[PDB]
């Protein structure tokens, strides 16, 4: 019928549906998160060559789950909306029952369970979107950045990139950021994120959208203008070797 064999193992041990899911991610936009130690920066690509649209009727790349919890994605639009709706119901239910403003990890546990759920058991097919869930847990100066997959796994991560040009941005994080010793300045964390997404978007600051989250609900998304002044600066560092 449709309650069976959507998802089963091969004798090779690949899952069909999960394997075609990871492919939607590579094709789609680019999202990256770099952590300071008193900030978390989320940089996003939104890529359109067609110029006959505005940002204020095209959905934002960073969606608020709470004032102090943010969600970024790469993948299908359709699927991601489903996941976003659960996370808001889970924030408010937690606040109600335990009477604590939310812990960001618990929310990952809820979004990740759903993702596991439609894979393990039939009557629903899986998702084709990977997410970054980030924020600050109350009474913390320490940034939280998580990745959850269509598999439904999650783990916590110091900088991480998904989407188009995962390799390039990966190399850049390997050679310019450390788990051991990250940016300690907010400024330097901004500089680094712009540097990474600039090499790949193949446009100026008019298709990179930066949003910086400092502790417990303090969120400011720098504009095209603000990013350009660092973009200038970047062309100057690169003309010491050119």
């Amino acid at each position: 019928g449709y309650d069976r064999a959507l998802s089963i193992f091969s004798p090779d041990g690949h899952i069909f549906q999960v394997e075609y899911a990871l492919e939607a991610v590579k094709r789609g936009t680019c999202a990256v998160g770099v952590k300071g130690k008193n900030c978390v920066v989320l940089g996003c690509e939104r890529r359109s060559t067609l110029k006959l649209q505005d940002t204020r009727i095209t959905p934002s790349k960073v969606s608020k789950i709470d004032s102090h919890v943010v969600l970024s994605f790469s993948g299908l639009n359709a699927d991601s909306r489903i996941l976003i709706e659960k996370a808001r119901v889970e924030a408010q239910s937690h606040r109600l029952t335990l009477e604590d403003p939310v812990t960001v990890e618990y929310l990952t546990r809820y979004v990740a369970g759903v993702q596991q759920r439609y894979t393990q058991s039939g009557g629903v097919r899986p998702f084709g979107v990977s997410t970054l869930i980030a924020g600050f847990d109350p009474r913390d100066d320490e940034p939280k950045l998580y990745q959850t997959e269509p598999s439904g796994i999650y783990s916590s991560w110091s900088a991480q990139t998904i989407g188009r040009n995962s390799k390039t941005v990966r190399e850049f994080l390997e050679k310019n950021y450390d788990r051991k010793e990250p940016p300690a300045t907010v400024e330097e964390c901004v500089k680094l994120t712009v540097r990474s997404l600039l090499e790949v978007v193949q446009t100026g600051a008019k298709n990179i959208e930066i949003t910086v989250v400092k502790p417990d609900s303090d969120i400011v998304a720098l504009s095209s203008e603000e990013i350009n002044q660092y973009v200038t600066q970047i062309e100057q560092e690169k003309q010491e070797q050119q």
Binding site: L96, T97, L98, E99, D100, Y106, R109
Partner: peptide, 17 residues
């Protein structure tokens, strides 16, 4: 499960509900 010390604040409210 959640590896977190439960509050008194949470204990009363689970009960009340």
């Amino acid at each position: 499960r959640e590896k977190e010390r439960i509050s008194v604040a949470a204990a009363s409210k689970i009960l009340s509900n």
